[PDB]
Amino acid sequence: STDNAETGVIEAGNTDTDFSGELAAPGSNHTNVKFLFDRSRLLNVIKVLEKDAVFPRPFPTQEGAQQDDGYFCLLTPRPTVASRPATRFGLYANPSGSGVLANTSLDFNFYSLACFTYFRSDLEVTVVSLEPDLEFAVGWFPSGSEYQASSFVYDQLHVPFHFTGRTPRAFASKGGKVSFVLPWNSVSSVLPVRWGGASKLSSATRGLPAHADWGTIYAFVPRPNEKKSTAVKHVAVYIRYKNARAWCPSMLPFRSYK
Amino acid sequence: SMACYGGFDLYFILDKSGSVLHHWNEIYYFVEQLAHKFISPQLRMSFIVFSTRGTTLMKLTEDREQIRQGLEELQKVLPGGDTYMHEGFERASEQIYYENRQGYRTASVIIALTDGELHEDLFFYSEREANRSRDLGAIVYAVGVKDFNETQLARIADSKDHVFPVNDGFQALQGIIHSILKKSC
Amino acid sequence: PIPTAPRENSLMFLSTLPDDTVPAYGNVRTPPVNYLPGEITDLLQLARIPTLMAFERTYVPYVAVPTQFDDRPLISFPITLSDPVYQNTLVGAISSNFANYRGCIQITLTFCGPMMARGKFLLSYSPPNGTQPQTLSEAMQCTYSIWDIGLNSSWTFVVPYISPSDYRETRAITNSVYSADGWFSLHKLTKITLPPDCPQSPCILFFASAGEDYTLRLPVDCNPSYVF
Amino acid sequence: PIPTAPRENSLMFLSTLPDDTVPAYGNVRTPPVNYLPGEITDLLQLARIPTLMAFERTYVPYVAVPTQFDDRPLISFPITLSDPVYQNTLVGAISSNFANYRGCIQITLTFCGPMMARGKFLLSYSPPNGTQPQTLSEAMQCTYSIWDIGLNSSWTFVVPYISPSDYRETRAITNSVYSADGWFSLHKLTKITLPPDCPQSPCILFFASAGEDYTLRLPVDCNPSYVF
Amino acid sequence: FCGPMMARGKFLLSYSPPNGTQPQTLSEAMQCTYSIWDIGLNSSWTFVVPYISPSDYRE
Amino acid sequence: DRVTTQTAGNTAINTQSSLGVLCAYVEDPTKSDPPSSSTDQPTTTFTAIDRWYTGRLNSWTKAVKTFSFQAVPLPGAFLSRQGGLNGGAFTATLHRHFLMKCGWQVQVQCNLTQFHQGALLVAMVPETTLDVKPDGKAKSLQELNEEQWVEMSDDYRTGKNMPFQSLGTYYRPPNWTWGPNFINPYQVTVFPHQILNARTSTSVDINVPYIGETPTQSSETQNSWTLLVMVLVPLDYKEGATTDPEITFSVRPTSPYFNGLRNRYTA
Amino acid sequence: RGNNGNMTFNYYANTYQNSVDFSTSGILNPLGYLK
Ligand SMILES: [Mg+2]
């Protein structure tokens, strides 16, 4: 069918448009955005806390900072680094040495189907243990709050301040899991998948949204600091995007030909 | 020392960052003419590239079939990326540490092609990894391409006079490489 | 108490369970998104947008038309949505995240040459044969459509859905030998007769959109090799 | 028995679960509290009551007005509810126990000087700029309101809610550089012309109340450093 | 435009009101009363110089 | 049929090979309601900012390869004055209002002849940092006027070189491989686009509404759209023809809603 | 409705399970209109 594609709008035609044929039946609705993003996937593998940690200091962190890394899961499909929102995703090709290997995360299953710019949904976090018989718990603090980092001596036991709070501290059973659904808490109307504005928190980094997150979870162990174990235990954070809505179509990542 | 080195080794740790996209043939012709002028069997040379991934593009070898093919792979290099010179030195420090397992006394020389304009938080790591090659008995020369930073190379190199620009330090490295080949066995 | 006998799949975390879970921090009034225009209701609003293909010349969205006559297709690529001419199209990069498809791929062309370039082009679609068709007398017998160059500058050849099954596979895993659903092939019919002082080798810019009946099924895990 | 399949979050004590639990010792008729007057229905009945601020002079709820002219704000403090002029106000000490706020801070003044003290004061509110405004010609352009001293002795400057988000943060955690929602700044416009035999340096007593639309959200754990 | 028929081009007519300095840059007739004239099938443009004056009858 | 004169305020622009206004995401992108995140009375449009602001863009030689793009930040071009795109009464109002909520309406003119071939892909690209150097600094006019067309490397196709927070000396600096502000150059036609072909038109017409993560964004930080001119087919001509055709662009802000009046922005 | 097969019974309410927007005051339409 004779067209002009310089116009920018092409009417999607069928076989009957040029030839003799008919329309096929509608297959299914598995491309529905509220249906397609509504399934769980691995987000980040964070180490389980055992003491009242220091939250990671803001960038640029200098050496001699006695902070606690690899502990907080900033719940976001966008690339993160050191439990803080980043712009580039970077893994370690040859991690020999040298400093602190920063925990990065990315939602691999999201950006392959995030052909849009803005995305709003609830979040259903399931925190699966990666340790046999682990009796852990799961904190949370919203987009814009900060970690309460101290302890209080309860009967000569340094019970930390992340055992309590007005935010959900879900306690897992022995060998169980933690599953709860978090609302869209951030101050932005939508989470920018791609962002081009500047956040003026620092020397203004272009393309870094400051409040594109559902918060930040952290696993801990419900014992005081005297009962701190030795081997560092992990946990695995599965998230699901409940009630997904997506705006403003955009690009999919570049599949290299090599 | 007075004892001759059993093997004289050479490291072309080459910068292929996004900032040397306009000066890559100047870098390559500095390596095309220091690999052809030295075809001696006592010299082993390696071609290390770095922009973001520090990459051993050719291992430390002396068979001249490979060095002919090593330069014909540096010509197929497109620059682009950040400037991770701390990983340019980790690909050599994994090869000085291997050649110390042979048990010889080897004078491994590091030639560091660079643009000099390093980030402030990467110069801490590039100096820290250079000092781990100066713990392993290597000598680091920073071949400066057009405009660079001397003070950002006075700590990568051994002193402020080991830094050479590329138009002056072509023959000046021939006065150092061939100086030690007579000092070798 | 109500006597319940819980099933064998108790305490099983399932990633794609069609159900909700316990709310933790409810009664949150989100700020309204009524101001945002252009909501994606469904990702088949985006397979229908024609995106550029890429051709082994070094990957180029257009086909150069060399002036030398030879009896073979000018460009030829199979109709298989794992073929590397579809990797960076929204037809291909959405459907490679799925397992099946159904409907008509729509190949839009665009003659980006000069305005004075007259010519005719015989698009085609062979169904999967034992041998890929090469002669212009072999794409004459398949599903062809002659495209003249004139005032307008685009032709949308609709690759039909001829299949022995209601949902074709979206990835040539095993085997389809080089023959899954056959081959598109742009033959040139008459040579492009250019007036004097005009550029040789004009460029046919290819697109790839989905039909109005192109429908996808069965999400799978994606390929995370875009991030490496 | 009813076959139930219990979920993955079974036997989880959650501190903020919106539900009841099993009663242990019920059927207790409590004595009636109908005699007590003044029940707090809601804690925004108490942010609206103006309480005294405190100023780095040694912390003083009033601003002394020195008689020497200088072109800078007499007192200047940012509109951020983690700033240490708000720690001992019911606007600040209730909102620091929360995570967000929305609405208008209301700064009530009170001229506690002599009755014969005539003068004029240019209150202001800059939105967050790159530089804090200092000149009287720079608070003239912001949201100002001139306050004359006369028979009445109070002015309630209502700090507006100008924000790019429906709920501002209530604590300057990271970063807001010294600039979160801008700065209140009481400039003096004309010098206070006192008659003879009257005290120099009269005192403007500052309050800080919440607006009729000031609303709070998201409780957090408090700061227990009041008990140390 | 009395040129050939195949001559494509565009022309930015203008009208500055009386300034202290005559405008010269294309970025200075962009701000005055301009009107872009394309050359095509038709071959005439009638730029109407407005009547902007502090008096009802100019000299 | 194809002769459309688009009068706006006191600046009417003309096009005699018009393909049609590509109204994006809605029927009428001019219609917009005031921001819900400002309790003060917003400064609406007025008759000195409802006009066609026009500035040049770089020439298009034969040396320009496929996919070599050229990006215009909106409203980033009114403030840095890229291409001579001086806002005038709009930039002098944009500097004094803290938040700004507008939708754009662009038009790119590049008149080829009937003996030239080539095709641009003019596309209002939302939310990209294509104007920023990888080291964080935004480009200046001395830096744009030396590369002339920012070529599509693999750092742009992967998003390897988008601006970032340096982690510091504490963390080991990781090998960056990807960032979401990439360009997939084969999929830029999903954006509101027209193809500026050398045989169908001289000017393209795109009309986009306000989009953004907030109901209104800041004035000095936002890059919610990006007028992206991408070369899909390289320019070719026989010798004697008019070398290096000019590219201009004409930008009109449709219904802006300024908020938060303060003095002129001094960084 | 999404990927929700529990057609019958919602235990928690709307504002607890979901997160509704606060007020201020199929048919696949195209994402770009030629006008
Ligand atoms: Mg570099």
F247: CATH = 2.60.120.20
A210 chain-F contacts, CB cut-off 8 A: none
Structural biology method used: cryo-EM
The angle, 0 to 180 degrees and rounded to 10, between the axes of the packed helices B120-133 and B86-99 is 10
Backbone torsions φ then ψ of D92, nearest 5 degrees: -85, -40
Measured CA distances, D205 to D50, D147, D188, D193 (Å): 11, 14, 15, 19
What's the one-letter identity of residue B111?
I
Domain count, chain A: 1
F36 chain-G contacts, CB cut-off 8 A: 24
The token pair that represents F252 in the structure block: 């009109």
C-beta separation of A121 from A245 below 8 A: yes
Q: Is the previous residue joined to F215 through a cis bond, with omega within 30 degrees of 0?
A: no
With H, G, I as helix, E, B as strand and everything else as coil, classify residue A122.
coil
CB atoms near residue D159 (< 10 Å)? 20
Measured CA distances, B77 to A176, B51, F149 (Å): 52, 11, 22
Q: CA dihedral in degrees (D195, D201, D207, D212; nearest 10)? A: 40
Burial of residue C174, with CB atoms counted within 10 A of its CB: 0-12 exposed, 13-18 middle, 19 or more buried: exposed
CB atoms near residue F17 (< 10 Å)? 17
- Beta strand segments in B37-104, E: 43-50, 54-61
Residue D43 has what DSSP assignment?
G
Q: Which chains touch A (3 or more CB pairs under 8 A)?
A: B, C, D, F, G
Q: Is B184 assigned to a binding site?
A: no
Helix then strand then coil, % of chain B, to nearest 5: 35, 25, 40
Backbone torsions φ then ψ of E2, nearest 5 degrees: -95, 20
B121/F169 touch (CB, cutoff 8 Å), yes or no: yes
Q: Is the previous residue joined to C165 through a cis bond, with omega within 30 degrees of 0?
A: no
Cα angle: C228, vertex F222, A192; to 5 degrees: 45
Q: Is any Cβ of chain G less than 8 angstroms from the Cβ of F195?
A: no
Which of E1, E30, E46 to mutate against chain F (most F CBs within 10 Å)? Answer: E30
C-beta separation of D98 from D199 below 8 A: no
Q: Is B126 assigned to a binding site?
A: no
C20/G15 touch (CB, cutoff 8 Å), yes or no: no
Comparing alpha-carbon positions, the chain A residue that sits nearest to C17 is A39
Tell me the Ramachandran region of residue B124: left when phi exceeds 0, alpha when psi lies from -120 to 50, beta otherwise. alpha
- Beta strand segments in E3-57, E: 10-13, 35-38
Between CA A153 and CA A52 the distance in angstroms is: 12
Between CA D147 and CA D123 the distance in angstroms is: 7
What's the one-letter identity of residue A23?
L
Q: Assign domain B1-185 to a CATH class.
A: alpha beta
Q: Is any Cβ of chain F less than 8 angstroms from the Cβ of E8?
A: yes
C-beta separation of A183 from C30 below 8 A: yes
What's the one-letter identity of residue D197?
D
Cα angle: C98, vertex C226, F119; to 5 degrees: 90
Residue F32 has what DSSP assignment?
-
Between CA F247 and CA F184 the distance in angstroms is: 23
Listed residue (C153, C71, C165, C70) closest to C110, CA to CA: C153
Q: Which chains touch E (3 or more CB pairs under 8 A)?
A: F
D220/A141 touch (CB, cutoff 8 Å), yes or no: yes
C-beta separation of G8 from A233 below 8 A: no
Residue A58 has what DSSP assignment?
P
Between CA A215 and CA B130 the distance in angstroms is: 40
The token pair that represents D220 in the structure block: 């957090």
Q: Is any Cβ of chain F less than 8 angstroms from the Cβ of G23?
A: no
Listed residue (A196, A195, A191) closest to A213, CA to CA: A191
Listed residue (C220, C126, C223, C131) closest to C169, CA to CA: C220
CA max distance for chain C: 95
Backbone torsions φ then ψ of D45, nearest 5 degrees: -75, -10
The token pair that represents A34 in the structure block: 């509220």
C-beta separation of F217 from F99 below 8 A: yes
Between CA A87 and CA A80 the distance in angstroms is: 7
Q: Do chains D and A touch (3 or more CB pairs under 8 A)?
A: yes
CA of B119 to the centre of ligand 1 (A): 9
Between CA C142 and CA A110 the distance in angstroms is: 40
Residue C226 has what DSSP assignment?
T
Give D171-206 as a DSSP string: S--S---S-SS-EEEEEEEEEEEPPSS--SS-EEEE
Comparing alpha-carbon positions, the chain C residue that sits nearest to F188 is C51
Q: CA dihedral in degrees (F123, F127, F131, F132; nearest 10)? A: -160
Between CA C124 and CA C189 the distance in angstroms is: 12
With H, G, I as helix, E, B as strand and everything else as coil, classify residue B120.
helix
Specify the residue for token string 């004097």: C196
Q: Which domain holds residue F112?
A: 1-267
**Out of A7, A9, A38, closest to residue G3 by CB:** A38
CB-based burial, B79-110: b 16+ in 10 Å, e otherwise:
bbbbbbbbbbbbbbbebbeebeeeeeebbbbb
C-beta separation of D182 from D79 below 8 A: yes
With H, G, I as helix, E, B as strand and everything else as coil, classify residue F92.
helix
**Pairing between strand D118-123 and D145-148?**
antiparallel
Backbone torsions φ then ψ of E28, nearest 5 degrees: -110, -25
Between CA D184 and CA D55 the distance in angstroms is: 13
With H, G, I as helix, E, B as strand and everything else as coil, classify residue C137.
helix
Supply the Cα-derived Rg of chain A in whole angstroms.
22
The token pair that represents B80 in the structure block: 């682009």
C-beta separation of F101 from F217 below 8 A: yes
Helix then strand then coil, % of chain F, to nearest 5: 10, 35, 55
Architecture of domain D1-228: Sandwich (2.60)
C37/F177 touch (CB, cutoff 8 Å), yes or no: no
Listed residue (C138, F122, C97) closest to A41, CA to CA: C97
C-beta separation of C24 from D18 below 8 A: no
Supply the Cα-derived Rg of chain C in whole angstroms.
24
Measured CA distances, C144 to A185, C118, C196, F23, F137 (Å): 56, 20, 31, 35, 53
CB atoms near residue A157 (< 10 Å)? 13
CB-based burial, F118-155: b 16+ in 10 Å, e otherwise:
bbbbbbbbbbbbbbbebebebbeeeebeeebbeebbeb
Supply the Cα-derived Rg of chain G in whole angstroms.
17
C-beta separation of F226 from F125 below 8 A: yes
Handedness of CA B24, B29, B32, B34 (dihedral sign): negative
The token pair that represents A92 in the structure block: 């370690």
Listed residue (D107, D95, D69, D132) closest to D205, CA to CA: D107
With H, G, I as helix, E, B as strand and everything else as coil, classify residue B129.
helix
Specify the residue for token string 């030295």: B38
Q: Which domain holds residue A23?
A: 1-258
The token pair that represents A129 in the structure block: 């243990």
Between CA D170 and CA D156 the distance in angstroms is: 22
Helix (H) or strand (E) holding B138: none
Tell me the Ramachandran region of residue D97: left when phi exceeds 0, alpha when psi lies from -120 to 50, beta otherwise. alpha
Backbone torsions φ then ψ of C158, nearest 5 degrees: -95, 105
Secondary structure tally for chain B: helices H, strands E: 5, 6
